[PDB]
Design a protein around this ligand. Structure first.
Ligand SMILES: CCCCSC[C@H]1CN(Cc2c[nH]c3c(N)ncnc23)C[C@@H]1O
Ligand SMILES: CCCCSC[C@H]1CN(Cc2c[nH]c3c(N)ncnc23)C[C@@H]1O
Lengths: 230, 230
């Protein structure tokens, strides 16, 4: 049982990194992987960097060099569903690209040729995460998470996403790329992130302020989830 | 010296593929690599699939599994510069994402955090490509190539690119993702593509019509360039 964990930013991986025993590091392809035991569980924790390509590169390296059994994508996210507040958890049942458009060839908006329109997250991983949410008594929303190479702060950027993906519960910049890579190698995948902002209302300022809260909450979730899978 | 070559589509790699001696096929992650010799020179040719993540995944696997010394990204492109006809060659001086936006945190438009705002293509590769262009007496333009996860077909997409990157000579969907991976592994990189359309309201029709011409012209250039580098 080796669990892969991927976060984009230093701030998102630092708490999980500090809790790894017999921690060794691989710096490769401009990313970092940290290997060891987390509460006596073998894990590979990747710091990918930001955006779709960084995440895809990182995910590929992780899968190649660490051969994890599953991948959990952790970190912050912009909340779209109205029940969500800063700190709350979001769990993917599906990921889609909100910025992909080959509709001129009759693909569905969001869909890239050779891909499904959206990528289904693993039902066992989702079940596990929902049990972790009940144990910890966290507030959480399960739903479609959308990814793009844009930081969303209201206006037409947010309106476009709500028009094209009315059911999207959160927006971010890596999850669908990781899902795409995992799909291609048939590795079970799930996103377990926490809200740093509401993708509007000066989200850049909320992000500066509440990223630490979001890192702490997703970290709590991930630790518990990893324990529960082992 | 082993030369890596990356194309997105079957129609873009098929002619080069058929020229490889001692050909082996590695099928992995929804991507296919063909290794062997092209007129005596060691090559590895990737069929990546379409879009940024597909290209990032494939370039990553290509670099890891084959360790090429340079990467040439080939195939078709939507022409933006004035002096470009269907069939003409475009050569990258630089690549940027046209769909990346983290301007809320002070980055330049198209720049992702932790990356340069554009990726400089290798000067020795560019020089060789240009020598080949002259040798074969082709019409070519060297300059900024922009990538995104969208097939550009006039309207907002084209308008947005011409506004944000008035100096861009062509648009496509993989090159910058490949440059990004190459940047992270310090591998020299160039784009040598051919025009299939001009990214306007009739681009989908022109692409269907002229993909084969663009594939042939890029293939001729890449075959020539491979021997020049050899
Ligand atoms: C300070 C340097 C720049 C930060 S770019 C934002 C980080 C946080 N990630 C998740 C994320 C939270 N809120 C979001 C929003 N409103 N839009 C889109 N993504 C998000 C995506 C990306 O890795
Ligand atoms: C299966 C049908 C879907 C094909 S999607 C377009 C292909 C061709 N590639 C280059 C390309 C030529 N013209 C373009 C344009 N107008 N916009 C953006 N990219 C291009 C990108 C991608 O690999």
């Amino acid at each position: 049982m080796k669990i892969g964990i991927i976060g984009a930013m230093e701030e998102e991986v630092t708490l999980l990194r500090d809790k790894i025993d017999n921690r060794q590091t691989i710096t490769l392809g401009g990313c970092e992987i940290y290997t060891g035991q987390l509460n006596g569980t073998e894990v590979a924790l990747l710091k990918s960097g930001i955006g779709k390509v960084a995440a895809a590169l990182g995910a590929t390296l992780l899968l190649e060099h660490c051969k994890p059994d599953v991948i959990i994508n952790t970190g912050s996210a912009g909340g779209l569903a109205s029940t969500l507040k800063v700190g709350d958890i979001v769990v993917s049942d599906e990921t889609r690209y909100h910025d992909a458009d080959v509709t001129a060839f009759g693909y569905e908006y969001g869909q890239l040729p050779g891909c499904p329109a959206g990528f289904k997250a693993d039902d066992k991983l989702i079940a596990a995460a929902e049990s972790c949410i009940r144990e910890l008594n966290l507030n959480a929303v399960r739903g479609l998470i959308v990814s793009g190479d844009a930081f969303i702060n209201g206006s037409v950027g947010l309106a476009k996403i709500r028009h094209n993906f009315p059911d999207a519960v959160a927006v971010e910049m890596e999850a669908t790329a990781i899902a795409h890579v995992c799909h291609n190698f048939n590795v079970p995948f799930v996103v377990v992130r926490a809200i740093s902002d509401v993708a509007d209302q000066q989200s850049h300022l909320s992000f500066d302020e509440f990223l630490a809260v979001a890192a702490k909450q997703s970290t709590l979730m991930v630790e518990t989830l990893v324990q529960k899978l082992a």
